[PDB]
Write a protein that binds this DNA or RNA. Structure first.
Lengths: 142, 206, 175, 37
RNA sequence: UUGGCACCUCGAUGUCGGCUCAUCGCAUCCUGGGGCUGUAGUCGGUCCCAAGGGUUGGGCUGUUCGCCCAUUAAAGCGGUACGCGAGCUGGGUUCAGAACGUCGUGAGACAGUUCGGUCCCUAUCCGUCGCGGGCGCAGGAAAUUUGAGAGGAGCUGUCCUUA
RNA sequence: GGAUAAGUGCUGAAAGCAUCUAAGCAUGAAGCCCCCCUCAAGAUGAGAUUUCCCAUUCCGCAAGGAAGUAAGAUCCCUGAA
């Protein structure tokens, strides 16, 4: 008969730089903390996670020939409405969304998964508009 | 880049230093006026507004009155917004007229097509009908909806609906004549939309 | 039998500078040059002489060790003597000229052809046919020369078109 | 070209090389020019 | 494709061809870009990359297919229940009539032929095309707008000059 | 226009040569992303800009609720582009 949290939460705000990082090994931590598995007061149905900021998304890294050969497909609901974008041009034009895609993929699915995605806030560069939240840095265990 | 907007009237014929007819469209553009002058610092893009009317105060409203009262003009009915032009040229309260253009400039024009209503596949999408004889009980109908395997109907399959009322552009037209005293343009050919309707004219996007 | 193992003298009117880790810069009469190199490599200029080294022996380090020396030899040879490439051309109405710095070609087309050496390279037209590219970097020189040669590459039946002076053109029999 | 999986040299002057991970054959004789695919 | 096996379906999964409607693959018919040539040129052959778009109208036959006439840049190969019958037709196959040949003692029969022969259904759900209402978008309103994102379009000849 | 396919290459070693390739550079298609046209903030990530209205009255401890309104819109009516 342990505790199961509800409205007894203190969601901090963390910050992460990505100057040389592999998005997969990074995202596998940011999603964990968005879900709250870095806390003792974890429950599967409450979103005990913690808000996250990411900077210099453009400045991520990859292994191998992914920039040339990794392909983000995306289909409309129209015939022949398949579309493809390489990781390179995703990185250039908008790395926000490719980070978001990876993290969304490794998040749980459902309303709760979406709501913990809503805590994420990715930004190109090193600007961080969310000064008011008084966040702190989070180095990566990996 | 340039542009103006007025109202369509009708069509007629005009000669050109020859016996050469021209099917002409007639537009009245009473002198349009600037209303707002947008910027990338606040509005995220450079652009201006243009008003074309002289409404009644019984028809206008307070916010419109203020928004125009920035300038020294009256409320307007047809207000729209031009993009990608020279900005330093224009000002607020500044009137623009037909003598911008001349009698040989090419144009892209824009308007709102006529309303044809809830029409069928043929008139709307140019399909072919079935035979009217040889035992057929099929005509004026859209066709099959698709194959069997996907258990559904693909998108984009074309069907009846409210044909018309679409924003349409027509490119590479040619101005024929101007009457700035009457505030009139005479354009080679025909345009989208019905009489009394709004028509935004633009320097052609070559 | 090895390239990068060797050494490159630095005769005179030359100054080498490790501006940083690897961003070499060279100077001299013809002008100057710069290159950035792979940082695992090791470069040490002694008195009048340059030495190169690699940490290890892999397919990568070996190749880099060779390329660095060959490339630096090209650099200094260009800054001292400059690089040059000739181009002949063979036809009837085939000829060349210049519009100032630019190059102009009347070969075989309804139109003429124009070429622009924008990058501190010069071109010389001692004859109507013969042409010379002249600069400091083999890379850019050969690039421009190939840009030229692609215009009207030769033909085998009648050896026509642009043609490197030291070229061995293949031949056919016009039936 | 002569695209084929059975890529070989033909004459002694034919010279096999590898390029972009693919196998190719070089010679002055362009008919000896080959590639896998 | 011809097939083999009999796994769903015989308390019913309608079966050829055609019309309308398209859609996908590319092993590309044309158009585009190239290599090689026993490529002089013009035309070509073959191979490679390319599926964006386009890819005819008639005679005969129920026909598919095919042959033929005349064109075209070309007159592509296939899949989608040999796409699509609660969308159409129903000429053929494949009910009952009758007939020819043939077989059978005969009743009758023939992937042999011929003539003629009822194609039902007010769309509940999803889906598709259009149209409105409600609420939301940390006050309530009128206007103009950004653009994520979506869809459309995307073909080609002939002549003159170069000559 | 940009990046590319096949292809063409320049420089260049591994492999004293040669080499379009591993480093590094550039070209190169009706194709890809744009440029062209249309829809588009339910983009619940619900955006931006301009202008208008004012911050009233009753309860209710507060929470909050109703009950008249402003700007404005509609019912209703004349009609159609």
């Amino acid at each position: 008969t342990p505790m199961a949290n509800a409205s007894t939460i203190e969601r901090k705000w963390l910050v992460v730089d990505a100057a040389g990082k592999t998005l997969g090994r990074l995202s596998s931590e940011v999603a964990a903390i968005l879900r709250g598995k870095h806390k003792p007061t974890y429950t599967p149905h409450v979103d005990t996670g913690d808000h996250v900021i990411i900077i210099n998304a453009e400045k991520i890294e990859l292994t191998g020939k992914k920039l040339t050969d990794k392909i983000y497909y995306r289909h409309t609901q129209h015939p022949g409405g398949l579309k493809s974008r390489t990781a390179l041009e995703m990185r250039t034009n908008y790395p926000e969304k490719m980070l978001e895609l990876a993290i969304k993929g490794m998040l749980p699915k459902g309303s709760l998964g979406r709501q913990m995605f809503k805590k994420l806030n990715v930004y190109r560069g090193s600007e961080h508009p969310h000064e008011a939240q008084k966040p702190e840095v989070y180095e990566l265990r990996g | 880049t340039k542009g103006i907007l007025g109202r369509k009237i009708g069509m007629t014929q005009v000669f050109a230093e020859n016996g050469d007819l021209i099917p002409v469209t007639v537009i009245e553009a009473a002198p349009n006026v600037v209303l707002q002058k947008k910027t990338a610092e606040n509005d995220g893009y450079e652009a201006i507004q243009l008003g074309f009317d002289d409404k009644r105060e019984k028809l206008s409203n307070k916010p419109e009155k203020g928004h125009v009262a920035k300038a020294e003009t009256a409320p307007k009915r047809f207000v729209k917004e031009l993009r990608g032009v020279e900005m330093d040229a224009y000002e607020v309260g500044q009137e623009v007229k037909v003598e911008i253009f001349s009698a040989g400039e090419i144009v892209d024009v824009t308007g709102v097509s006529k309303g044809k209503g809830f029409q069928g596949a043929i008139k709307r999408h140019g399909q072919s009908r079935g035979p009217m004889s040889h035992g057929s009980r099929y005509h004026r109908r859209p066709g099959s909806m698709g194959p069997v395997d996907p258990n559904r109907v693909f998108k984009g399959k074309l069907l009846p609906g409210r044909m018309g009322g679409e924003q349409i552009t027509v490119q590479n037209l040619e101005i024929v004549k101007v009457d700035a005293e009457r505030n009139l343009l005479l354009i080679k050919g025909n345009v989208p939309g019905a009489k009394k309707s709004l028509i935004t004219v633009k320097s052609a996007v070559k | 039998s090895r390239v990068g193992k060797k050494l490159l003298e630095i005769p005179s009117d030359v100054t080498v500078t490790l501006n940083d880790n690897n961003t070499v810069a060279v100077k001299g009469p013809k002008g100057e040059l710069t290159r950035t190199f792979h940082p695992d490599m090791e470069i040490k200029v002694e008195d009048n002489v340059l030495t190169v080294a690699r940490p290890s022996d892999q397919k990568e380090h070996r190749a880099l060790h060779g390329t660095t020396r060959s490339l630096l030899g090209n650099m200094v040879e260009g800054v001292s003597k400059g690089f040059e490439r000739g181009l002949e051309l063979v036809g009837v109405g085939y000829r060349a000229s210049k519009s100032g710095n630019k190059l102009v070609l009347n070969v075989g087309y309804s139109h003429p052809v124009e070429i622009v050496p924008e990058e501190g390279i010069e071109i010389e037209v001692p004859s109507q046919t013969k042409v010379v590219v002249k600069g400091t970097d083999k890379e850019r020189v050969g690039a421009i020369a190939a840009n030229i040669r692609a215009v009207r590459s030769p033909e085998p039946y009648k050896g026509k078109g642009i043609r490197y002076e030291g070229e061995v053109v293949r031949r056919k029999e016009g039936k | 070209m002569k695209v084929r999986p059975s890529v070989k040299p033909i004459c002694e002057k034919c010279k096999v090389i590898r390029r972009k991970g693919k196998v190719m054959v070089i010679c002055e004789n362009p008919k000896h020019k080959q590639k896998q695919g």
